Amino acid sequence: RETESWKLLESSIIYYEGNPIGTVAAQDPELAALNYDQCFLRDFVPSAFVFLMDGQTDIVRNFLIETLTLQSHEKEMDCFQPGAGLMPASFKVESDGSKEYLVADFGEKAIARVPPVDSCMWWILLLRAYEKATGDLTLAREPKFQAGIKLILDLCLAHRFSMYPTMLVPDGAFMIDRRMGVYEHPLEIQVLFYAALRAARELLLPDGDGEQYLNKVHGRLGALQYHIRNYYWVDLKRLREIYRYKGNEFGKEIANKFNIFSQSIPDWVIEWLPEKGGYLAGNLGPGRMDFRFFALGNLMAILAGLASEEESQRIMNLFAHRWEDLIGYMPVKICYPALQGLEWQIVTGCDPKNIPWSYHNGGNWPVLLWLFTAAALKTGKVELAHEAIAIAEGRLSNDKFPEYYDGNNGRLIGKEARIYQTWSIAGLLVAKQFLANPDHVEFISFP
């Protein structure tokens, strides 16, 4: 392209041994580098989509290859190894002098040592997206790629103590990589887990032990989908039911299985839901239901076919009804509402980067526009995509594409936002491209 955004993305590209292998997190000139000079696996996904749609796919291929290689490297902290299948949160290229080499952060350098659980899932989704964009079936089939997928599946499908098909994680294990009360069974992890499973179903070779893998995958998918749809789904009708639940019920055949106390349901959600609206809850576990709306989880649930067609309609209906809360002056609010006061103190451990309506704690994130556009297109609500894109276009180039926006409605540029945040740039590009050729959404959606 000849646009400003195309050129900005082009300079983000990281080269290794004369080859493009990824993109930097940001091209901010004045902020301390911290880990933003690295290539984050989750960040790379919207950049990858841009390159796949342009038709220059070697950077995507090289990324997938190098990341797979990174997985093979021994990862350790104090004589203990995680599962071999773990993908790192990010990597950078280090020049010792002379020859180049790749250094990864698997969680052993990460702040608070958060595990990048979503990384390995995005890896699979990007592998699928590569395949569907290019038609190249050879990459995924190759021995090392097959083995790589299986290692990821081993970690995902690992046996639980719990009675539930969902996946258990520590706090800060996905896009929200800091302590945000998204421990246990956060929506985003479950939705990505579900999507990656469907992808693996397309990607795996039957020959070898794959048959057993595929049967595991098919089994988990059904259970996962049933559980998510029946227990996470929130609308007025279901809320009315939960609110009338009786506490401390014991036995197999009971209504309140997770022992939710109605007195704990927050006041804001009853007023917030429209009659024809609804969404997937943020979390579910013993005695706990997180009613916070999480944007990525809900939008990807539409794209992955996890939410039903009607349920997808009701999520979009919610976006329309509460446009100022979830889009406001910058698509898209990452979650709603913000944690405030003592709740912010207890749940985040007084994390100053996640003060109310900032960053993960109810900030607005430009990148999420690409998921929103795709979901809007999938649900036949093109007009919402136009409006969201229009709003983002009106401020991003002028604000130099900040990492995130703050405030109840995203009025403020993020407190500590990097400028020239690559996936803020890629996010808008992808959204416009989807809008131009809706079919491309099939790279990331499932029938």
Ligand X SMILES: OC[C@H]1O[C@@](CO)(O[C@H]2O[C@H](CO)[C@@H](O)[C@H](O)[C@H]2O)[C@@H](O)[C@@H]1O
Distances (CA, A) of 236 to 90, 255, 277: 41, 17, 8
Bridge pairing between strands 13-16 and 412-413: unpaired
Query: Nearest to residue 224, comparing CAs of 156, 290, 174?
Result: 156
If one asks whether residue 353 binds a copy of itself (CB under 8 A), the answer comes out as yes
Distance in angstroms (rounded) separating the CA atoms of residues 257 and 377: 36
Q: Under the criterion CB under 6 A, does residue 242 sit at the interface with ligand X?
A: no
DSSP 151-190: HHHHHHSPPPSSS-SSPPB-SS-SSS-S-SS--BS-HHHH
For residue 105 the two structure tokens come to 């952060």
205 binds, among ligand X, a copy of itself, none (CB under 5 to 8 A by kind): none
In whole angstroms, give the CA distance from residue 330 to residue 389: 9
Least separation in angstroms between residue 165's CB and ligand X is: 20
Residues 42-101 binding a copy of itself (CB under 8 A) are 75-80, 82-86
Rule CB under 8 A: say whether 171 interacts with a copy of itself: yes
CB of 178 to ligand X, least distance (A): 5
Site for a copy of itself in 183-242 (CB under 8 A): 183-185, 219-220, 222-223, 226-227, 230, 236, 239-240
Count other Cβ atoms within 10 Å, centred on residue 282.
24
Task: Choose among 117, 246, 290: nearest CA to 192.
Answer: 117
Q: How far is the CB of 397 from a copy of itself (least distance, A)?
A: 16
Feature table: binding site for beta-D-fructose: 35, 111, 177-178, 359
CA-CA distance, 440 to 431, in Å (whole number)? 10
**What residues contact 95, with CB distance under 8 A and at least 6 apart?**
none
Could you say which of ligand X, a copy of itself, none residue 226 binds, taking C-beta under 5 to 8 angstroms by partner kind? Answer: a copy of itself
* Residues in 162-181 that interact with ligand X by CB under 6 A: 175, 177-178
Which of residues 25, 52, 68, 93 is near ligand X by CB under 6 A?
Answer: 25
Cα 407 to Cα 389: distance, rounded to the nearest angstrom: 19
74, 173, 185, 217, 353 from 169: Cα distances, Å: 22, 7, 7, 19, 22
Residue 274 CB, nearest distance to ligand X (Å)? 30
Choose from a copy of itself, ligand X, none: what does 40 bind? Cβ within 5-8 Å by kind.
ligand X
Of 32-51, binders to ligand X (CB under 6 A) are 34-35, 40, 42-43
Of the ranges 161-169, 292-300, 310-318, 432-440, which one interacts with a copy of itself (CB under 8 A)?
A: 161-169
| Residue placing its CB nearer to a copy of itself in the complex, 131 or 171 | 171
Residue 16 pairs in a beta bridge with 19
Question: Which residue type does 82 have?
Answer: P
43 binds, among ligand X, a copy of itself, none (CB under 5 to 8 A by kind): ligand X
Contact between 161 and a copy of itself (CB under 8 A)? yes
Positions in the binding site for ligand X (CB under 6 A): 25, 34-35, 40, 42-43, 110-111, 114, 175, 177-178
